[PDB]
Amino acid sequence: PRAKIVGEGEVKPSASVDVSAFTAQPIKVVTQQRVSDEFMWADADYRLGVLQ
Amino acid sequence: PRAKIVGEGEVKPSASVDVSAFTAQPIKVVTQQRVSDEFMWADADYRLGVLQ
Amino acid sequence: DFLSVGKLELPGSMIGAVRDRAIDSGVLAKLSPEQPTIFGPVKGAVFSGV
Amino acid sequence: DLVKAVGLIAGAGLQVPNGVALDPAFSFALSTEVYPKGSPLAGQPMYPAAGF
């Protein structure tokens, strides 16, 4: 805001404020993997941590 | 919602309920009144109790 | 078909109140130390030249 | 290409940049230079670069 020089008896004026705003919509994000149950068995048999 | 009679084989159906949403904007109500200073004095001097 | 979250118009949340720029208050207060006086005019004499 | 990019944010002297994100291929293009023995910042990387 900007000040203003006034004298004895002179009117003391006013200023203003310039506000604003922003919005954001919530987005849903996923990711899926298709793993055969025959694979998860070999994942624990040969002890290779492919899924872990 | 209304349930449906289901046989041991028939498909259990789904009902349809519609949920809506209202919105109420806040409103300000104001009641003003002006009384004279002499009157305000008169209420206090005579134990009148008008103001209360 | 089903109950969506679109019919139910959600309000939301407030991040807060941020000021765009850093405040550019002053510079005269940093260069020349404020020497306060009583109310009224001020006046000084300057003797120049040899 | 980076300094002139910063010079667009602090060029007007309004905003103050404090964060920078680079692409892995671009971070290698940044010439490894560092300051010589004389300067008071001797031994410090003059640019983000890679390897440091």
Chains touching chain B, criterion 3+ CB pairs below 8 Å? C
Residues C29 and C32: their CA atoms lie apart, in Å, by 6
C-alpha closest to that of C20 among A48, D14, A22 = D14
Residues B22 and C7: their CA atoms lie apart, in Å, by 10
Residue type, B2: R
Searching chain B, which residue's CA lies closest to the CA of residue C8?
Answer: B21
Q: B50: burial class by Cβ within 10 Å (0-12, 13-18, 19+)?
A: exposed
D12 in reach of chain C (CB within 8 A): no
Whether A4 and A12 have beta carbons less than 8 Å apart is answered as yes
Distance of CA D26 to the CA centre of its chain: 12
Residues on chain C touching D16 (C-beta within 8 angstroms): 22
C-alpha closest to that of B17 among B27, B3, B6 = B3
Sorted by sequence, the CB contacts under 8 Å of residue C2 that are 6+ apart come out as none
**H runs (alpha helix) in A1-52:** 37-45
Residues A35 and A41: their CA atoms lie apart, in Å, by 11
Residues D16 and B8: their CA atoms lie apart, in Å, by 71
Cα dihedral sign for A32, A35, A37, A43? Answer: negative
Cβ–Cβ gap C7/B19 under 8 Å: yes
Cα dihedral sign for D26, D29, D32, D34? Answer: negative
Residues B16 and B2: their CA atoms lie apart, in Å, by 9
C-alpha closest to that of B17 among D9, C20, C4, D52 = C4
DSSP B39: H
Whether A51 and A35 have beta carbons less than 8 Å apart is answered as yes
For residue C5, give how far its alpha carbon lies from the nearest alpha carbon of chain B (Å).
9
C-alpha closest to that of A15 among A31, A3, A28, A5 = A3
Helix (H/G/I), strand (E/B), else coil: C40: coil
Helix (H/G/I), strand (E/B), else coil: B7: coil
Our CA angle for A27, C10, C12, nearest 5°, is: 70
Resolution of this model in Å is 3.7
Residues A40 and A29: their CA atoms lie apart, in Å, by 26
Structure determination technique employed: cryo-EM
C-alpha closest to that of C25 among D21, B34, A3, A28 = A3
Helix (H/G/I), strand (E/B), else coil: D29: helix
The token duo for A44 is 């624990």
C9 in reach of chain B (CB within 8 A): yes
Chains touching chain A, criterion 3+ CB pairs below 8 Å? none
The token duo for B24 is 């109420």
Residues on chain D touching C22 (C-beta within 8 angstroms): 16
**How far apart are the two ends of chain D, measured CA to CA in Å?**
20
C5 in reach of chain B (CB within 8 A): no
Cβ–Cβ gap B19/C9 under 8 Å: no
Residues C19 and A39: their CA atoms lie apart, in Å, by 56
Residue C1 CA neighbour count, 13 Å, CB half: 3
Whether B2 and B15 have beta carbons less than 8 Å apart is answered as yes
Chains touching chain D, criterion 3+ CB pairs below 8 Å? C
Cα dihedral sign for A41, A46, A50, A51? Answer: positive
The token duo for D35 is 């300051």
DSSP A20: -
For residue C12, give how far its alpha carbon lies from the nearest alpha carbon of chain B (Å).
14
The token duo for A27 is 């987005």
Whether D37 and D44 have beta carbons less than 8 Å apart is answered as no
Best of B17, B19, B22, B25 to disrupt the C interface (most C CBs within 10 Å) is B19
